């Protein structure tokens, strides 16, 4: 399933997009997860929220004005820590003259102009803000309350909203602990992704250590730091797979553990994100490298090793654990669809 590791995308019906469970283990047991990243679009019937138009006294408390730095495809992103803004002043700046998305035929042109720009006039993301824009009653894919296995650590299993304007972007990052993740664009416009094949992931951290070799004499995992910006055309030149999709308003996009993404906003948008968890995680967060420079997120694995791998919990407390991850391997919950 899926051989190529390309991206996929599912319209799942009112009855499928009920249980995200076991719609996480459908789309695994097609193989979307050796892309890394999947779209889901949901059945038209479904809204997370009748109306927007009640947040724009919504508090964003940290925006981050980010400052990009680079030259041939490989870019540093610094963050400045602007004072606190509502989304109505931070609407107010995605749309002007000053910070509004260029005029563009087709994502080609928009991309160029991204990939070319990307280092002046600093754009300023409304990154991070902790809170939900998911109603009450929302019982389907609702972010703020997956009910996956994650729950169990218990501010990891937690929504973050992300405003964005034109410009603004994430860097090259897995998530923490290697996490999956889920993220849907509520409004405004595009949101433009790039991913490493999970089975890949390793060919790009050796690429982006000969690139920046002071940052990982410094840091086993600098990557999580989320500064590493690398344009697809470098990613071509020294033969990395990696594919690309656009987000559009209303659509969810997947992160599969261990897959490597990166992209930006096409303008003003806003976006809910969390992480979650499957059976097929609880490897990758016992083998996960994490960052040793800062102190980072840390899930103590003991808890999911007790609990889903009884047999090897001594074996691995010993730390003789020698389990090598097949990155092709669906979540064992995808048994049922194959
Ligand atoms: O659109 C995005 N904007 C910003 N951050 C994104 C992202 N992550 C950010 C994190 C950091 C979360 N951390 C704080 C916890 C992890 N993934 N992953 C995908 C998409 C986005
Ligand atoms: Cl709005
Ligand atoms: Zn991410
Ligand atoms: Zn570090």
């Known amino acids: ?91 107010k700046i995605a749309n002007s003259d000053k910070y509004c998305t260029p005029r563009y035929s087709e994502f080609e042109e928009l991309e160029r102009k991204y990939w070319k720009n990307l280092t002046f006039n600093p754009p300023i993301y409304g990154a991070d803000v902790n809170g939900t824009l998911y109603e009450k009653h929302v019982d389907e894919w609702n972010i703020g309350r997956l009910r996956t296995i994650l729950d169990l650590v218990e501010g990891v299993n937690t929504p973050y909203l992300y405003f964005g304007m034109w410009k603004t972007s994430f860097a090259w990052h897995t998530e923490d602990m290697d996490l999956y993740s889920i993220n849907y664009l509520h409004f405004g416009e595009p949101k433009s992704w790039y991913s490493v094949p999970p089975e890949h992931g390793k060919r790009l951290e050796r690429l982006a250590k000969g690139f920046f070799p002071g940052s990982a004499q410094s840091c086993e995992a600098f990557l999580r730091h989320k500064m590493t910006l690398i344009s697809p055309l470098m990613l071509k030149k020294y033969g990395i797979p990696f594919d690309k999709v656009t987000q559009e308003a209303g659509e969810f996009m997947i992160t599969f553990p261990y897959g490597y993404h990166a992209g930006f906003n096409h303008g003003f948008n806003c976006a809910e994100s969390t992480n979650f968890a499957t059976r097929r995680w609880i490897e ?33 407390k010993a730390g003789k654990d020698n389990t090598v991850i097949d990155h092709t391997l669906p979540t064992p919950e995808a048994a049922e669809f194959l």
């Open 1 to 91: 399933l899926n051989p190529s590791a390309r991206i996929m995308t599912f319209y799942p019906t009112m009855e499928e997009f009920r249980n995200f469970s076991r719609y996480i283990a459908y789309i695994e047991s097609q193989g979307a997860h050796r892309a890394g990243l999947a779209k889901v679009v949901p059945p038209k019937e479904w809204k997370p929220r009748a109306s927007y138009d009640d947040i724009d006294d919504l508090v964003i408390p940290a925006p981050i004005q980010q400052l990009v730095t680079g030259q041939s495809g490989l870019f540093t992103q610094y963050n400045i820590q602007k004072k606190a803004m509502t989304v109505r002043e931070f609407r």
């Open 284 to 316: 990758y967060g016992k083998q996960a490298v994490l960052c040793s420079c800062r102190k980072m997120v840390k899930i103590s694995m003991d808890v999911f090793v007790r609990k889903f791998q009884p047999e090897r919990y001594k074996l691995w």
